[PDB]
Curated annotation (Swiss-Prot):
Disulfide bonds join 27-86. The keyword Magnesium does not apply. InterPro entries: Ig-like_dom, Ig-like_dom_sf, Ig-like_fold, Ig/MHC_CS, Ig_C1-set, MHC/Immunoglobulin. SMART domains: IGc1. This is Immunoglobulin lambda constant 2.
């Protein structure tokens, strides 16, 4: 098959994690370069600790390859930071997005 561009998918942990003094975010990468990519993480616009350690991707039933990066860091950084971003080597270009823990103010959690 031809060349495909990687998608942006950020699925952070839940409150249960933050309460456990733990929280690791991971970005899913499907339908991308032929097993050729890079693992990089950064908060919004500013760079992040970058405590990731992933290995080369692999081929799937989609006749293509896929990768994924996971940054293990303190939970406080999640809310403390402004947003998260996943840098990947594709088409000689990098993607950026803004993420957040909360997504509602009109209504919050109760006792």
């Amino acid at each position: 098959q031809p060349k495909a561009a990687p998608s942006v998918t950020l699925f952070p942990p839940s409150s249960e994690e933050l309460q456990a003094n733990k929280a690791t975010l991971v970005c899913l990468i499907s339908d991308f370069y032929p097993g050729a990519v890079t693992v990089a993480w950064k908060a919004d616009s500013s760079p992040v600790k970058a405590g990731v350690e992933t290995t080369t991707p692999s081929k799937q039933s989609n006749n293509k390859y896929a990768a994924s990066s996971y940054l293990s860091l303190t939970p406080e950084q999640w809310k403390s930071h402004r947003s998260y971003s996943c840098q990947v080597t594709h088409e000689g270009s990098t993607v950026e997005k803004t993420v957040a823990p909360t997504e509602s103010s009109e209504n919050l959690y109760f006792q």
